[PDB]
Enzyme design. Structure first.
Site, PDB file in Angstrom:
ATOM      1  N   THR B 122       1.811 -22.679  23.509  1.00  0.00           N
ATOM      2  CA  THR B 122       1.490 -24.002  23.041  1.00  0.00           C
ATOM      3  C   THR B 122       2.366 -25.097  23.610  1.00  0.00           C
ATOM      4  OG1 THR B 122       1.285 -25.373  21.050  1.00  0.00           O
ATOM      5  CG2 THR B 122       2.862 -23.541  20.934  1.00  0.00           C
ATOM      6  N   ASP B 184      -8.579 -25.168  24.212  1.00  0.00           N
ATOM      7  CA  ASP B 184      -9.629 -26.173  24.013  1.00  0.00           C
ATOM      8  C   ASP B 184      -9.631 -27.254  25.137  1.00  0.00           C
ATOM      9  OD1 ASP B 184      -7.318 -27.419  23.117  1.00  0.00           O
ATOM     10  OD2 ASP B 184      -8.220 -28.465  21.472  1.00  0.00           O
ATOM     11  N   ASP B 334       2.194   0.008 -14.757  1.00  0.00           N
ATOM     12  CA  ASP B 334       2.478   1.342 -15.291  1.00  0.00           C
ATOM     13  C   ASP B 334       3.848   1.297 -16.018  1.00  0.00           C
ATOM     14  OD1 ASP B 334       1.555   4.457 -15.143  1.00  0.00           O
ATOM     15  OD2 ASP B 334       3.712   4.376 -14.578  1.00  0.00           O
ATOM     16  N   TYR B 465      10.040   9.159 -18.992  1.00  0.00           N
ATOM     17  CA  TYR B 465       9.111   9.683 -19.985  1.00  0.00           C
ATOM     18  C   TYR B 465       9.822  10.475 -21.051  1.00  0.00           C
ATOM     19  CZ  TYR B 465       5.101   8.978 -16.743  1.00  0.00           C
ATOM     20  OH  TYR B 465       4.178   8.470 -15.879  1.00  0.00           O
ATOM     21  N   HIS B 523      -6.193   3.746 -11.220  1.00  0.00           N
ATOM     22  CA  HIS B 523      -4.816   3.597 -11.665  1.00  0.00           C
ATOM     23  C   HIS B 523      -3.865   2.915 -10.650  1.00  0.00           C
ATOM     24  CE1 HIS B 523      -1.052   4.210 -13.802  1.00  0.00           C
ATOM     25  NE2 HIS B 523      -0.545   4.637 -12.655  1.00  0.00           N
TER      26      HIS B 523
HETATM   27  O1  LIG Z   1      -7.161   7.348 -13.939  1.00  0.00           O
HETATM   28  C1  LIG Z   1      -5.962   7.830 -13.536  1.00  0.00           C
HETATM   29  C2  LIG Z   1      -5.666   8.663 -12.419  1.00  0.00           C
HETATM   30  N1  LIG Z   1      -4.356   8.942 -12.360  1.00  0.00           N
HETATM   31  N2  LIG Z   1      -3.813   8.293 -13.424  1.00  0.00           N
HETATM   32  C3  LIG Z   1      -2.424   8.338 -13.707  1.00  0.00           C
HETATM   33  C4  LIG Z   1      -1.897   7.364 -14.534  1.00  0.00           C
HETATM   34  C5  LIG Z   1      -0.540   7.340 -14.815  1.00  0.00           C
HETATM   35  C6  LIG Z   1       0.298   8.299 -14.288  1.00  0.00           C
HETATM   36  C7  LIG Z   1      -0.238   9.278 -13.478  1.00  0.00           C
HETATM   37  C8  LIG Z   1       0.684  10.296 -12.926  1.00  0.00           C
HETATM   38  F1  LIG Z   1       1.750  10.544 -13.701  1.00  0.00           F
HETATM   39  F2  LIG Z   1       0.090  11.501 -12.707  1.00  0.00           F
HETATM   40  F3  LIG Z   1       1.260   9.892 -11.780  1.00  0.00           F
HETATM   41  C9  LIG Z   1      -1.596   9.312 -13.166  1.00  0.00           C
HETATM   42  C10 LIG Z   1      -4.755   7.600 -14.169  1.00  0.00           C
HETATM   43 MG   LIG Z   2      -5.036 -27.628  22.775  1.00  0.00          MG
END
Ligand SMILES: Oc1cnn(-c2cccc(C(F)(F)F)c2)c1
Ligand SMILES: [Mg+2]
Ligand SMILES: Oc1cnn(-c2cccc(C(F)(F)F)c2)c1
Ligand SMILES: [Mg+2]
Lengths: 546, 546
Positions: B122, B184, B334, B465, B523
């Site tokens: 340019t 152009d 999540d 968890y 998910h």
């Molecule tokens: O409809 C759906 C398909 N997978 N999930 C799912 C959801 C959360 C965690 C996990 C896992 F912990 F397995 F990663 C899987 C939901």
């Molecule tokens: Mg030009």
């Protein structure tokens, strides 16, 4: 004997107190004396206010409960509240009014400096108002100065309940007799006094500090002005950006708001800005304090041309590209100073504003080799000494502690003239083996530099001085331009290399240039006069970069 | 044969062209046809305009030269310019008018995707106007999509001079016959045609693209809608903050403006946001995409309680303290979703706005153990499976590729029910050894996750968890509160674990909650429907967080 000090927030570390706003409002509005305090305190331990202070409900949930209380208190006093009476309004105004009580903070700081454990114990609330950011900022600024912050609403307990003092003692790992507790509410002091803690009923600050001084035996009042806040390296966010395959740049980053990139000189570090970093973040900026190429945790390739201005600048541009920053304010010192002027000349679209400490902007002389220009000034002889690869490296690496201790000195402490360095055979040939510590630096601080320079030594840093010809040729392309973006030049009275008079023609190239000047300040500007640097940069930022 | 494509900026990658503004202004103002173009071009190769385009002078220096030219051209045409005639004004307006020509960009992108080297060549200027940031932003957005950007004012050469085409060829490392060049201005094409480059005279975009398609043999027009921009991990700024002695958090950071903290789910990565990071930065935000504790380059201590919500949240607060951020917008998915709701409930002063993808806010039931609550829903059985330390670790670590390939799947591709997982003896007991690649992810992308999870495996992640009881007890302290800060809930139609209906009562706790909903989205929301996620977050950010 005393090992700990505990401060309240409202009325002690912060003023005016929000309770005080109930009193004033009543007065301003000609309401029955104490009507607003009655409504605030209604129901005592079971009332809306306690549930707020215990964290059961949030501030916005509390507002219409206090309102109800105000209505009930006023019917029973047989009066009416003014049309437009607004609790939200009264509290918004009170909470923004309230500021850090600077002499209390500075006493707390001093006490922590003589080894006290310090804490804030406060009855406070979960604040979800549209305007809550103002209080989040206050708490941020205060809490970094203390060992603990204990908030009624986080722990689910309130002064005067005795369990919160036991919780306090437990957090402090101290017996009650090792503790002084300051509060503006006597009822809140009582349970502390019951366990045998020293207490101070804080009305005016100076009397409270006088009592605090007597009882700790440390001087807190009339003390000299303290240094700005410094940075602890391991409390910082450390950032790393690869600007090309063998080159990653490290920086430390604090604050939000317009981006401000700090560029240190030779032979320094991001940590050379340790005094400006908290102050500029506190003033509303996003500070990015670099390790420039060749230094610290940034890459340090061996080759001379890797450190010519052109390459260095292009790399700073890429650094902004990868961070997603369309601009930054560029502030430099010494070599970093020279670099920010070149950023302003070659990439003004990327530079919000440019400032330099000590380093003036001097256009390249198209009719004179840069080597000759340098030979014309006895005080730049140290630059010729730096030319031969390996010579300066060996002297500077030989003993790192002695190196930074010899270099980092205030103007009345110098141990090395920059005078006929080549002829003498080196920078330190007539300086001690073990220099004394400059007033500007602690032993700990020197050891941070020593440890930084153990990674790559002085080859990369010295290379900055080894592109005289290349930089000159590149600079010559810019001789028709002017710097027309916002620009600040800060001169240092006692820098005997980058002398103030060398900047005297800058208005020819930078017609709207602004200036600051710092008296009794040597070459190491940021650490020599940190308070004055901070004041001059923040004033210029707020007026020109914002 | 063709291996490279070169695009001009004005009139080709960006529209309307600034030259066009000379024409329009003349027309708007009833000036003699071509008067402004004459003034712009006055002096040809020696005139003010060429010195500007070669980088000799800056835009602000050029302005009053063009003005002089306009005066001279109008005296010789024997006319006057209107009172208030303003070159600065005309150019300010023209330069902000000019926008990326999206279908040209997307053709350039497609060509680079089939292996072309792409460049922008340019004629442009050093821009030092008060308003230059607007152009710095355009150039930033464009240049990340190309191999090279060559700017007349940086290289000191201009189209049509033949040396710039030789410079072009040399930068491209291509012979002239391997190159198509679009422009152009026909005069600018000629020297390219002289070397035997394919040229395209660009008038309307679709005709130019039609020619471009014919000559490269690649489909460029009528192509399906492309994915948003993704991130290359090694082009990012990587940040690291120690929030306490054994815990440092890593994050990737792009953009400026209000801070927006992205919090991924299990078992994911900062890189799960790879599609939202450029788009949100581009939309005016400062994105901080975390590795949450337990993941990637963040620390992963072994102990279960290190991952309870309370500790996790306090650590995110500390992370803001150390960065100097009084607030951030918190956006989670999540587990990160659950975490941002808790940030909003326990630290609203630190949360500018809160949004969750898939994860609803459900208050703890004070009358039912969380384990039982989880046992009441067949689809949460995978959570019971995760309880026993070591069991899920062994299955998930056994083969990492198979793990992420099995998990990261669109709704119509699933290979594992979340159904009676404990009873079956594991998550994958009835899934293939080598799953096929989901349409959502490339082999390269899976291998990024695999490599991330090689550092700490699944212990830290699974620990999230393992604090059902602890999180429940902490959540129970917040049952009198409401979320009254700005809040968005995004539901995903085909998430068969976090189903849209589970969010149906959220207005009881979050009265002013806003919503988005994404159809045909499983998910893995961000990578499944990245375009729709981006549109819903940016709209909500601009209206509620800004
Ligand atoms: O409809 C759906 C398909 N997978 N999930 C799912 C959801 C959360 C965690 C996990 C896992 F912990 F397995 F990663 C899987 C939901
Ligand atoms: Mg030009
Ligand atoms: O007035 C003064 C005292 N020291 N300087 C100085 C200036 C620049 C560089 C250096 C060096 F390279 F030695 F680090 C020293 C100026
Ligand atoms: Mg008080």
């Amino acid at each position: 004997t005393l090992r700990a000090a505990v401060f309240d927030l409202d009325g002690v570390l912060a003023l005016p107190a929000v309770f005080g706003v109930l009193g004033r409002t009543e007065e301003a509005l000609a309401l029955p004396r104490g009507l607003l305090n009655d409504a605030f305190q209604k129901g005592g331990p079971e009332g809306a206010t306690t549930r707020l202070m215990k964290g059961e409900i949030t501030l916005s949930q509390w507002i219409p409960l206090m309102e109800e209380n105000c209505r009930k208190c006023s019917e029973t006093a047989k009066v009416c509240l003014p049309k437009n009476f607004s609790i939200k309004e009264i509290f918004d105004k009170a909470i923004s009014a309230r500021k850090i009580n600077r002499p209390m903070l500075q006493a707390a700081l001093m006490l922590r400096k003589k080894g006290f454990t310090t804490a804030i114990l406060t009855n406070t609330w979960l604040d979800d108002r549209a305007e809550r950011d103002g209080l989040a900022q206050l708490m941020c600024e205060l809490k970094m100065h203390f060992d603990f912050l204990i908030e009624s609403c986080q722990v689910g307990m309130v002064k005067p309940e005795p369990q919160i003092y036991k919780f306090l003692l437990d957090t402090l790992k101290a017996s009650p007799s090792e503790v002084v507790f300051l509060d503006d509410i006597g009822a809140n002091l009582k349970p502390a006094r019951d366990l045998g803690m020293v207490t101070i009923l804080v009305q005016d600050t100076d009397t409270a500090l006088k009592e605090l001084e007597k009882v700790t035996g440390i001087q807190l009042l009339n003390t000299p002005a303290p240094l700005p806040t410094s940075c602890n390296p391991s409390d910082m966010s450390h950032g790393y950006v690869t600007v090309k395959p063998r080159v990653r740049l490290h920086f430390v980053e604090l604050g939000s708001g317009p981006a401000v990139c700090l560029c240190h000189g030779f032979p320094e570090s991001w940590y050379s800005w340790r005094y400006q970093i908290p102050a500029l973040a506190q003033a509303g900026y996003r500070v990015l304090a670099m390790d420039m190429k060749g230094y610290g945790e940034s890459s340090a390739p061996p080759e001379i041309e890797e450190y010519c201005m052109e390459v260095l600048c292009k790399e700073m541009v890429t650094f902004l590209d990868k961070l997603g920053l369309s601009q930054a304010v560029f502030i430099g010192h010494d070599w970093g100073g020279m670099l920010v002027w070149y950023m302003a000349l070659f990439y003004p679209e990327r530079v919000r504003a440019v400032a330099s400490l000590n380093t003036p902007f001097i256009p390249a002389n198209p009719n004179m080799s840069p080597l000759e220009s340098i030979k014309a000034n006895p005080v730049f002889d140290y630059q010729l000494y730096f030319q031969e690869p390996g010579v300066a490296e060996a002297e500077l690496e030989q003993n790192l502690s002695r190196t930074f201790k010899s270099l980092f000195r205030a103007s009345d402490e110098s141990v090395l003239s920059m005078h006929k360095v080549c002829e003498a055979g080196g920078l330190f040939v007539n300086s001690p083996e073990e220099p004394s510590l400059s007033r500007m630096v602690t032993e700990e601080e020197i050891q941070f530099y020593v440890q930084q320079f153990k990674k790559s030594g002085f080859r990369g840093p010295l290379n900055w001085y080894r592109n005289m010809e290349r930089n000159w040729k590149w600079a010559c392309k810019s001789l028709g331009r002017k710097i027309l973006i916002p620009a600040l030049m800060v001169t240092a009275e006692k820098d005997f290399v980058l002398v103030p008079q060398m900047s005297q023609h800058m208005e020819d190239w930078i017609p709207h240039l602004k200036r600051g000047h710092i008296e009794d300040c040597g070459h190491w500007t940021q650490m020599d006069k940190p308070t004055e640097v901070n004041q001059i940069l923040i004033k210029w930022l707020d007026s020109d970069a914002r």
